[PDB]
Antibody, heavy 215, light 213 residues
Framework: VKLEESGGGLVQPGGSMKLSCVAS????????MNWVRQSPEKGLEWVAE??????????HYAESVKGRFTISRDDSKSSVYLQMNNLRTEDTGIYYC???????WGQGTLVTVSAAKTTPPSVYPLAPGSAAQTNSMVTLGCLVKGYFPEPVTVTWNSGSLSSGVHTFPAVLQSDLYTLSSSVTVPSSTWPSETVTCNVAHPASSTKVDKKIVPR | NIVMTQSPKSMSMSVGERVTLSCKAS??????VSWYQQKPEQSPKLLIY???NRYTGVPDRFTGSGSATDFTLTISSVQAEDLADYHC?????????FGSGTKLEIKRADAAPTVSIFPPSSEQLTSGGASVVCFLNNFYPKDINVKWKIDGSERQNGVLNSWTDQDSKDSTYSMSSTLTLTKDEYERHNSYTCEATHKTSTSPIVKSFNRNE
């Protein structure tokens, strides 16, 4: 079973945004569908439900979104939608489409409601100082500074390096996020076998690939 | 609105041990309670529905019980893969509501961090900034402190810290600390040090560089 979500990103307060979700692997027309959202401040919240053709696609909404959101579905496309209007900053969070009982979930998409402007990340290489010590392993990294909104995604060597990777949660400071990612590889393999961080920021349509070279 | 209450926020268990998670409803919700497992950066997954019915594909170490206002999820023998945040939810009455979640931490042996320090890049200096980064990687337990020194003197302003969730593969934690100065201030000092203090030792793990190196 798969629920594939589309949409999300940055929207101004008072603005509108539509989320979509295409179902495959369950008989969509027989299932009630929901939207659920999640935030650090408030946790998981149910948003809206939509029922079946036999009952005229009747709906339910959380009181906090009634009159501002519309849940809809297109059974011919096996798709459920959430149209959000007059958006408020308290509406920011990760939005998931789900089936009844929350049996099947989409992957989630971050909706950020803010008047702050999209800003692409600066991606800086973290390479050890020239007088750093020697060890059988070496740690390298990338510092991702000054972007808005979330998210960014970080890979190393386009995903082929994963075992030695830690990417850290972003922190917000005055309308801009900063994140970092480290990778640890055997020291005999760098710089001979190259190591590059790839930082994708879909909101600004920018991916940066920074190769980490010795100082 | 029906409130689902979960406490405590976290429990720390060794592999093989039994853990019981509790969930209190503010109203009688009959058997309309489900349990979900959520790992970081992932959607929740259904474990139990109807208070006690195990969902297809869920390992049999997971059971659910209870009714009316009190509900329990039991893991008979905790496995490393069970590292996650567990939420209950009620579907008795609209609006449907979720509990706040109990995190399950997997216990492991104490491990000191691997500490690495990095100077500002030339690219960042060109723009007028100077971030010094220290990674404190693969340690346990979770609590840790970083102290930044500039020419031997502590600096607290300009420090940004971030901690990972517990690592699925080795049950450790990691932390990144960034001291951000302007290029102007960075170029007026010589030595930059991060000191990691962790329960494994009162002696800090010290990494440093100087701008002459």
């Amino acid at each position: 079973v798969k629920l594939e979500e589309s949409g999300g990103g940055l929207v101004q307060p008072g603005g509108s945004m539509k989320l979509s979700c295409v179902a495959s692997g369950f008989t969509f027309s027989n299932f009630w569908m929901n939207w659920v959202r999640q935030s650090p401040e408030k946790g998981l919240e149910w948003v809206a439900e939509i029922r079946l053709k036999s009952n005229n696609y009747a709906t339910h909404y959380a009181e906090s979104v009634k009159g501002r959101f519309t849940i809809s579905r297109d059974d011919s496309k096996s798709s459920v939608y959430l149209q959000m209007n007059n958006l408020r900053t308290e509406d920011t969070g990760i939005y998931y489409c789900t089936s009844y009982d929350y049996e099947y979930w989409g992957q989630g998409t971050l909706v950020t409601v803010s008047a702050a402007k999209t800003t692409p990340p600066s991606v800086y290489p973290l390479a050890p100082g020239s007088a750093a010590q020697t060890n059988s392993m070496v740690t390298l990294g990338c510092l991702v500074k000054g972007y808005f909104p979330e998210p960014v995604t970080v890979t190393w060597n386009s995903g082929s390096l994963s075992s030695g990777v830690h990417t850290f949660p972003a922190v917000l400071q005055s309308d801009l996020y900063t994140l970092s990612s480290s990778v640890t590889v055997p020291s005999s393999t760098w710089p001979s076998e190259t190591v590059t961080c790839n930082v994708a920021h879909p909101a600004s349509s920018t991916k940066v690939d920074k190769k980490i070279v010795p100082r | 609105n029906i409130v689902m209450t979960q406490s405590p926020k976290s429990m720390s268990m060794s592999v093989g041990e039994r853990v019981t998670l509790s969930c209190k409803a503010s109203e009688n919700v009959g058997t309309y309670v489900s349990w979900y497992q959520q790992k970081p950066e992932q959607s929740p997954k259904l474990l139990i529905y109807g208070a006690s019915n195990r969902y297809t594909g869920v390992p049999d170490r997971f059971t659910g019980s209870g009714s009316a206002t009190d509900f329990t999820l039991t893991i008979s023998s905790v496995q490393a893969e069970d590292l996650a945040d567990y939420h209950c939810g009620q579907s008795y009455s609209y609006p449907f509501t979720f509990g706040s979640g109990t995190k399950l931490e997997i216990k492991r042996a104490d491990a000191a961090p691997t500490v690495s320090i990095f100077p500002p890049s030339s690219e960042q200096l060109t723009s007028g900034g100077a971030s010094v980064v220290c990674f404190l990687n693969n340690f346990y337990p979770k609590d840790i402190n970083v102290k930044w020194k500039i020419d031997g003197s502590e600096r607290q302003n300009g420090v940004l810290n971030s901690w990972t969730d517990q690592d699925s593969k080795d049950s450790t934690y990691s932390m990144s600390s960034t001291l951000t100065l302007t290029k102007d201030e960075y170029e007026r000092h010589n030595s930059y040090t991060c000191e990691a203090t962790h329960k494994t030792s009162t002696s800090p793990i010290v990494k440093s560089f100087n701008r002459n190196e």
